[PDB]
Structure formats: structure tokens, C-alpha cells
């Protein structure tokens, strides 16, 4: 199960001179390709811990809380729209992709860190006739707003796991793309169409009026036009 340093993904931005073997992300909320391990986050990125032993010491000492709860696994997968709380420093980070296509932290405040946006991949009726939604991180949230459909974004309180607000998939809404050649791009969508012998294709317009087309499962509605619910890094 040993993953090579060259075989490590480009999203992590590791230093190749560091070691022979890259960390392998554990099973968890996000898939292995778009995950970012906590050891990579703390050691190679935040430079807090110099080596994996004191990375394990930190994650023992429970300063690092991921999405509210406390994780002690060194290779715990932390992914897109994940809030990491370092309680000793009182600094909160939100993981967002860079425009070039790599992971990046964002310094966020406390009341921003209190909520998290998730893409509703499933809407279904569970047992005893209880509706539920399955978000992109794997969360199952009971009793949603009946207006919530597939590919809509829900703002989730971290303390309770409850949906406060939601954004509907609609033309002229600021979405974010999370896959493919277009990865790391922020833009409002022109439209959505069906591709013959293919899938739903979404046409998105950037700030500089450039048009780029991607898969339906790749998009992520971060907010409506002119009001992003989350903070965004400099450079748009």
C-alpha cells in the first residue's frame, strides 16, 4: 500500500526531495485523489511539524479539529470545503482549490468556520418515510427542505449537522468547478445542455467573459451572483 512520492498527486504540491514514499490518504469523507492528508497539511504546507512523529504528536494532542470534531489519524483525508480548526493558535482554515489546480488554505473567521457548504448528490426517502440528502462529503442529513434537489448546495452547521440555507442550481449563479481540465475555476454559468451520446454539459462564463464547458458533476454552486457565501482567495 506504499504510494510513491512521484505518484503523489499534483494537488498536494509536495517537495520531491523530501522522501521516497508519499503518504497515502486513509478511507474517509473524500476520495483518495482529491483528498489532502493531515500530515501533508501540517508538515509540508503549514510547516508546524517538521516530521511525521511530531505530526502524530500534534494529532495526539488534539489541537487539530477537522470539521468541528477531533481527528487523531495522521493520514485522515481532508478535502474540498473542509474547515480545519487549530485550537492552540485559534486559526481556522478552509480548504479551497487554487486557480492553477492545487489545494490551498484560506484564513477564515469563527462564524464563517461555523458553517460548511456541501453539494447534494442524492435526495431520497429513507426508511419510515424520512427524507434525507447525501452531500459530497458523505454526510446524510435527515429532514431537509423539500425544495432541495440534486446538484444544489446546502449550508451545514458543523455543531448540529443541520441545513440552514440552500442554493438552487440555476443559470446566472456563481459556481465553482471541482474537476478536469477546468479545475479551480470560479464563474457564473451560461447554461446547461445535453450532449448526444454523452452527459450534461455546463457552460460557464468567467470574469473575463471567457467561456468554458465542463461536466455536471464537476460544478459546485458557492453562491448566487455577486454574493459568495464563503470567503475567496485573492486573485479571483
Amino acid at each position: 500500500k506504499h504510494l510513491k512520492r512521484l505518484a503523489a498527486p499534483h494537488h498536494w504540491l509536495l517537495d520531491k526531495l523530501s522522501g521516497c514514499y508519499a503518504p497515502r490518504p486513509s478511507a474517509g469523507p473524500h476520495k483518495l485523489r482529491e483528498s489532502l492528508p493531515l500530515i501533508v497539511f501540517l508538515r509540508n504546507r503549514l510547516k508546524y511539524a517538521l516530521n511525521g512523529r511530531e505530526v502524530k504528536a500534534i494529532l495526539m494532542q488534539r489541537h487539530v479539529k477537522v470539521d468541528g470534531k477531533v481527528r487523531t489519524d495522521t493520514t485522515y483525508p481532508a478535502g474540498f470545503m473542509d474547515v480545519i480548526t487549530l485550537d492552540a493558535t485559534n486559526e481556522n482554515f478552509r480548504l479551497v482549490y487554487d486557480v492553477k489546480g492545487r489545494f490551498a488554505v484560506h484564513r477564515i473567521t469563527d462564524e464563517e468556520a461555523s458553517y460548511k457548504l456541501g453539494k447534494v448528490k442524492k435526495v431520497q426517502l429513507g426508511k419510515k418515510g424520512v427524507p434525507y440528502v447525501v452531500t459530497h462529503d458523505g454526510r446524510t442529513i435527515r429532514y431537509p427542505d423539500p425544495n432541495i434537489k440534486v446538484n444544489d448546495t446546502v449550508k451545514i452547521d458543523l455543531a448540529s449537522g443541520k441545513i440552514t440555507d440552500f442554493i438552487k442550481f440555476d443559470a446566472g449563479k456563481l459556481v465553482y468547478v471541482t474537476g478536469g481540465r477546468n479545475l479551480g475555476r470560479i464563474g457564473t454559468i451560461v447554461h446547461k445542455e445535453r450532449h448526444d451520446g454523452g452527459f450534461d454539459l455546463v457552460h460557464i462564463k468567467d470574469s473575463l467573459d471567457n467561456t468554458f464547458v465542463t461536466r455536471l458533476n464537476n460544478v459546485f454552486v458557492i453562491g448566487e451572483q455577486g454574493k459568495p457565501y464563503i470567503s475567496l482567495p485573492k486573485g479571483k
Partner: peptide, 17 residues
């Protein structure tokens, strides 16, 4: 007739050197 829709690390990485 098919679009790949893949991130390209070769395209993303700097190659001016």
C-alpha cells in the same frame, strides 16, 4: 465526439526552463 475533461499536470506545471 468525446471530451476528455481531465486535469493535465504537464499543462499546469511550468515548462519555460
Amino acid at each position: 465526439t468525446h471530451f476528455e475533461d481531465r486535469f493535465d499536470a504537464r499543462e499546469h506545471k511550468d515548462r519555460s526552463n
